[PDB]
Ligand SMILES: CN(Cc1cnc2nc(N)nc(N)c2n1)c1ccc(C(=O)N[C@@H](CCC(=O)O)C(=O)O)cc1
Ligand SMILES: CN(Cc1cnc2nc(N)nc(N)c2n1)c1ccc(C(=O)N[C@@H](CCC(=O)O)C(=O)O)cc1
Ligand SMILES: [Cl-]
Ligand SMILES: [Cl-]
Ligand SMILES: [Cl-]
Ligand SMILES: [Cl-]
Ligand SMILES: [Cl-]
Ligand SMILES: [Cl-]
Ligand SMILES: [Cl-]
Ligand SMILES: [Cl-]
Ligand SMILES: [Cl-]
């Protein structure tokens with residue numbers, strides 16, 4: 001069985017470029033007993049891959065998750081036709097012994113795109129769920145600041161916060177994204193590229209400050225928000241996408257006098273802290289909320305495996321409205 | 329009755345120098361009913377004063393706490409001879425209505441210097457107690473990193489950590505402070521000014537990394553420690569003394585990739601979060617541990633109120649062995 005694979009040709013320097021990637025074709029070996037052949041249906045690209053790539057050797061396959069189908073099987077538990085979540089990296093076909101696969105929720109209806117299993121009802125949505133509910137620890141009535149708010153993580157954060165009775169202020173990177181989050185029920189949404197002053201916009205959005213900060217961006221954006229956190233405010237550090245492609249030193253941290261006298265609690269997290277049973281319960285909640293209309297979503301589906309680098313680079317730049325997914 | 333007062337003549341640039349301070353002599357107003365006249369016995373100088381000074385107007389009294397004796401009284405609860413903690417600033421004599429004064433522990437013995445009420449068995453010791461036990465949440469068997477470790481905060485952090493069954497690594501600025509903390513039972517103590525590599529020294533001190541970081545210093549030192557924190561490691565942000573006297577650009581924040589991958593919890597605190605009740609129980613614990621020999625101490629007593637600016641500057645620069653105190 002042939003396969004195509006995207007490899008890291010050269011470690012990224014700044015933003016990735018086309019030349020940093022190399023497509024290779026190879027033939028996979030026959031299956032051994034207990035193994036399955038997986039055909040990728042949908043492949044995700046996500047900001048963490050800009051960081052995780054630094055641990056690869058040049059020539060290695062780019063890491064990542066996909067929704068795949070078993071197209072040949074010598075595994076009793078995994079017959080032909082089985083849909084799984086797998087992480088063989090950026091490849092069209094792969095062989096698995098089954099150990100590391102995750103199966104689709106049995107509740108998964110044929111009325112919603114399978115690509116959502118990589119987004120809203122997948123690891124980004126779970127990142128939003130646990131970051132907001134357990135790290136921010138919202139109980140209701142808080143004012144929550146969320147950046148990269150039209151991303152797959154941030155848009156779930158804001159919609160769950162509304163369900164919990166919070167006020168939500170969201171920062172986005174385009175005018176279309178403003179309308180999107182307006183439609184989704186955010187209390188305040190602004191385009192951070194076009195406001196005159198981030199400081200003044202955040203102050204008008206919540207004159208008495210912010211209880212919780214769900215931080216995907218980092219850098220100077222976060223320095224500005226930290227200056228508007230209430231005493232004992234909570235920051236959930238999910239990502240720092242404004243920094244991952246840096247070529248020079250990081251910006252200065254926030255003035256320590258602010259952090260100390262406001263007695264801020266800042267905790268970083270990764271979704272895999274929560275184990276399988278907790279993630280399954282949360283995925284079922286996310287799916288129920290989607291089917292009830294309480295969580296809406298947008299996807300940016302790009303056709304063609306050959307476009308996966310372009311998908312990744314466009315996503316890193318914020319060029320796309322909705323979760324970026326490649327359809328094989 | 330006359331008083332001498334140290335005022336801020338010029339806002340500090342970098343570290344203070346002598347010409348930034350001005351000593352003034354004035355006559356205090358007569359005592360009204362319910363008031364007491366307080367004579368300073370011991371006055372403390374502490375790093376937070378360097379930051380708090382930025383908010384003063386030129387001519388204002390420098391802020392700070394002292395142990396004082398009631399020498400004239402119209403307040404039945406505070407007869408002449410009563411010893412109190414008071415915060416009138418850097419002044420030899422002051423008037424109080426009594427409302428914010430604190431008597432010492434009832435069981436305070438005459439075998440313990442009164443000046444310890446400004447150190448090990450006072451606000452520095454309480455900062456150490458709550459920061460380590462509640463913000464870091466040590467439970468036993470952890471490895472603790474503490475910097476500015478020979479101050480009253482740091483020395484109490486290390487000795488409480490030892491009595492809880494932790495390993496403690498301390499960073500100090502002089503060889504004499506290395507010997508002091510070695511005698512106090514710190515597992516590893518190093519002079520950060522003379523090591524070839526802070527990264528390598530911290531690695532040798534704890535090859536598997538740090539569970540808890542009690543941080544008084546901040547800046548680049550803390551960025552290095554953050555790269556050696558264990559997964560779910562906890563940072564108690566008490567101070568950032570490396571930034572208080574630092575000219576020029578502020579230091580970069582820590583690499584977000586490390587903070588997020590290690591899922592660190594970083595919380596700032598001030599001792600005033602804990603109300604007078606819980607502070608009293610902690611103070612009793614500290615006194616009992618001093619009397620049992622589980623917490624030892626060293627003070628650097630400078631004679632003469634006229635030497636208080638010099639005491640402050642030497643303390644800021646790390647040049648004094650033991651908590652710096654001025655004896656009036
Ligand atoms: C899979 N996962 C959890 C997660 C987080 N950090 C990791 N870091 C590493 N090194 N390795 C991992 N596997 C990893 N996984 C995810 C995936 C995507 C997003 C995320 O932020 N995605 C963007 C995608 C933006 C877009 O598609 O436009 C978003 O805003 O939702 C977060 C967590
Ligand atoms: C009173 N207190 C709490 C505290 C903290 N920050 C504040 N900040 C401000 N602006 N105002 C306050 N009153 C204040 N109080 C204290 C006092 C001293 C130390 C302290 O760290 N002292 C040094 C003294 C160092 C030395 O003498 O060498 C130490 O390391 O023990 C900490 C907290
Ligand atoms: Cl190119
Ligand atoms: Cl390499
Ligand atoms: Cl997987
Ligand atoms: Cl966005
Ligand atoms: Cl819930
Ligand atoms: Cl300065
Ligand atoms: Cl130090
Ligand atoms: Cl020290
Ligand atoms: Cl000594």
Ligand SMILES: [Cl-]
Pocket residue numbers: 270272589
């Ligand atoms: Cl991880």
Ligand SMILES: [Cl-]
Pocket residue numbers: 613
């Ligand atoms: Cl205890």
